[PDB]
Amino acid sequence: GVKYTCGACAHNFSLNKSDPVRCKECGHRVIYKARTKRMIQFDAR
Amino acid sequence: VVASKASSSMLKIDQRNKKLNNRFIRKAEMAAVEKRKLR
Amino acid sequence: EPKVNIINAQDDEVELMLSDVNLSLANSLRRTMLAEVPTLAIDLVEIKMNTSVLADEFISHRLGLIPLVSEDVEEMKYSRDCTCEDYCDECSVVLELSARHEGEEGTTDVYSSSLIKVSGPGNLNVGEPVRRDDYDQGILLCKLRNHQELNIRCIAKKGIAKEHAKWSPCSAIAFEYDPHNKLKHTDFWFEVDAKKEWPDSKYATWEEPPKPGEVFDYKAKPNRFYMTVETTGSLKANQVFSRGIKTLQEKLANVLFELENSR
Amino acid sequence: DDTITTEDCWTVISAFFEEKGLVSQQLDSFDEFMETSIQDLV
Amino acid sequence: MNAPDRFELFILPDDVPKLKITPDSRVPNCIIIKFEREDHTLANLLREELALYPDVTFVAYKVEHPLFANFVMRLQTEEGTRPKQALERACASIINKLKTLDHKFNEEWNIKN
Amino acid sequence: MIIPVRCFSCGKVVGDKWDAYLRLLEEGKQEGDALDELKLKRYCCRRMVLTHVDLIEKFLRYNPLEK
Amino acid sequence: LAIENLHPDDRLLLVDPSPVFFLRRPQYVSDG
Ligand SMILES: [Zn+2]
Ligand SMILES: [Zn+2]
Ligand SMILES: [Zn+2]
């Protein structure tokens, strides 16, 4: 349901709150959440 | 490494500037010390 | 009674001489051209993806400072004065930038020429980023390596330099009068001799140096003012001068209207 | 020979910093510790 | 956090008038004018235009605080003339001067181009 | 980090002259002569280009975090 | 060739209408 990204090989996957926190392909122990989908706006000042 | 073009250009500029500084500053210092000596 | 004499003329700079005007009028004209002439600049940035090494607000600030063509910005409306819903074609210009690096080696530069105008006022010459030539690349915005992409949508609005310096049409306005100091408006600091310790003005040959036997003239006032107006490219120099005059006239007419309506 | 200018002194100082660095005392002390001190304490 | 909005320097609130005139009863024929959302650009122009009129005996302005965009003008004229009429004449005169200045600049630019 | 778009003091656009400056320095021109060639007269604008350090080249050597 | 290879009398003809020890040429990588 929620996207992640591996800290080593930059691979994208998903977790279901029951898998171990690991990369699928290279088995890194460090993963990062993906950027949101909400609209992002700045005032250019 | 596959260095960028700007970085390689800056490296060449740095080598040229280092050589030019090592010549000119040393020559100016030699001129200043000989002038201070002859006084 | 007021006179204008032009010394050098260019698209981006004019050097003129004002005579038979008050000092206050020339200074107010300088201030108006610096802070009150309306231009067009990017004000809202919608970021759809940004995987570069630069922060989002960093890139937004850089985008705000890019000068856009503002020739027909007088026919545009202020965003707060437009009755439209959200942004329309009569109060905003929409630009879009999409950059990416293809390949696994090297670096890609993102220039202001990559900004593409998508919508804006019909038949008005506003919105396009300023470019010196046809082969000029413009202002460096960002740098991208492999798998890094930038995809943004910008909204350009009308404003003045009082709100933010990105809307200023001018960079620097040189301003000077009385090169030989006949009015004694300044008292020259010196160690031995003030005459030979101070460099001569660049307009010193445009005025006759005072005679040695001349006495101080207390009835004189500043009369001739030299000024150079340099523009960022968003407007031409003559356009900036004319619109500064027009803005000052509009402010005075508004004061007069308020006075007459006060009764 | 020829005289030694200030630029020559700065060349010598550059050689010093090329060889030693700025944190050489910390690394050298720790290396001495790990290499011999643990064995001697044991 | 406590920084005011930058558009407050020149945007006039709905309930705030652009111009408020009150008499100064200490001396005869004097008024105090309060200008809102204005600064030295208009103040100095109006002051030094008015100072050259023979029937204007006193003219001055002050910006009380640089963090607030307003200035206050004091104007005193002769018995025959009213200060508001002098202010209107000054505004019209500066407008005419700017008009001829713009005309001559356009003429010279067309000549030199 | 990356060359500023405008001069801090006066606001002249200096962000389009970095690559030309590096080119001129490559050709062997002195820094003052190169700045003269780029029509940067006021020393406020000369300071912007003369004292800029390009840190983005170091930041770009780290591998991208998203692919 | 350069200014050094020029004849001294012709060098004297080059009159402005000497380097100083405290004006260095800028660098980017430094040393250490
Ligand atoms: Zn992985
Ligand atoms: Zn609208
Ligand atoms: Zn500058």
**DSSP per position, D1-42:** -----HHHHHHHHHHHHHHS-SSHHHHHHHHHIIIIIHHHH-
Give backbone dihedrals phi and psi of C175, rounded to 5 degrees, phi first.
-155, 135
- Which range marks the domain in which residue F14 is found? 1-66
Q: How many residues in chain G? A: 32
Q: How far is CA D10 from the centre of its chain?
A: 16
Tell me which of F17, F22, F26 to substitute to probe the interface with B (most B C-beta atoms closer than 10 Å).
F26
CB E31 within 8 A of CB E22: yes
CB A12 within 8 A of CB A24: no
The answer to whether the Cβ–Cβ distance between C137 and F10 falls below 8 Å is no
* Residue A44: both structure tokens together: 């250019």
Q: Would you call C181 exposed, middle or buried from its count of C-beta atoms within 10 A (0-12, 13-18, 19+)?
A: middle
Which CATH architecture describes the domain C39-165?
Beta Complex (2.170)
CB C108 within 8 A of CB C51: no
Q: Cβ–Cβ contacts within 10 Å for residue C158, how many?
A: 22
Q: Would you call C182 exposed, middle or buried from its count of C-beta atoms within 10 A (0-12, 13-18, 19+)?
A: middle
The resolution, in angstroms to one decimal, equals 3.4
Q: Which of C248, C79, G12, B24 is CA-nearest to residue E38?
A: C248
Number of domains observed in the structure of chain F? 1
Annotate A25-44 with b (16+ C-beta within 10 A) or e (fewer). eeeeeebeeeeeeeeeebeb
What is the rounded CA–CA span in Å between residue G8 and residue G20? 21
**Which domains are assigned to chain A?**
1-45 (2.20.28.30)
F1 Cβ contact partners less than 8 Å away, ≥ 6 residues apart: C54, C58, F54, F55, F56, F59
- The SS3 call for residue C36 is coil
Q: How far is the CA of E7 from the centre of ligand 3 (A)?
A: 26
What's the alpha-carbon Rg for chain C, to the nearest Å? 24
Give all strands (DSSP E) within chain E, no chain letters.
19-23, 30-36, 56-62, 70-77
Q: How far is CA C180 from the centre of its chain?
A: 30
- Alpha-carbon gap: A29 to the closest alpha carbon of chain C (Å): 22
Q: Which residue of G has its CA nearest to D21?
A: G32
The half-sphere exposure of A5 on its side-chain side, counting CA atoms within 13 A, is 11
CB A29 within 8 A of CB A40: no
Q: How far is the CA of F45 from the centre of ligand 3 (A)?
A: 4
* Residue A19: both structure tokens together: 């898998």
* Alpha-carbon distances of C229 from A23, C7, C10, rounded to whole Å: 61, 12, 10
What residues in B contact C106, CB-CB < 8 Å?
A: 2, 4
Q: Which of A3, A14, E91, F15 is CA-nearest to residue C166?
A: F15
**B8-17, Cβ contacts within 8 angstroms, sequence gap of 24 or more:** B9/F22, B9/F23, B9/F25, B9/F26, B10/F22, B10/F54, B10/G28, B10/G29, B11/G29, B12/F26, B13/F22, B13/F25, B13/F26, B13/G28, B14/G27, B14/G28, B14/G29, B16/F28, B17/G25, B17/G26, B17/G27
* Residue D8: both structure tokens together: 């020559």
CB C112 within 8 A of CB C95: no
The answer to whether the Cβ–Cβ distance between A32 and F67 falls below 8 Å is no
- Alpha-carbon gap: E86 to the closest alpha carbon of chain C (Å): 11
Q: Tokens 């100072």 label which residue?
A: E51
| C17 and chain E in contact, CB less than 8 A | no
Superfamily of domain E1-113: RNA polymerase, RBP11-like subunit (3.30.1360.10)
The answer to whether the Cβ–Cβ distance between C143 and F2 falls below 8 Å is yes
Q: Which fold has domain C1-38+166-263?
A: Gyrase A; domain 2 (3.30.1360)
Method: cryo-EM
What residues in E contact C251, CB-CB < 8 Å?
A: 41-42
What is the rounded CA–CA span in Å between residue B9 and residue F23? 8
Q: How far is the CA of A37 from the centre of ligand 1 (A)?
A: 23
CB C36 within 8 A of CB C161: yes
Chain E: partners with 3+ C-beta pairs within 8 Å: C
What is the rounded CA–CA span in Å between residue A35 and residue C27? 51
| D6 and chain B in contact, CB less than 8 A | yes
Output the domain CATH number for residue F53.
1.10.10.60
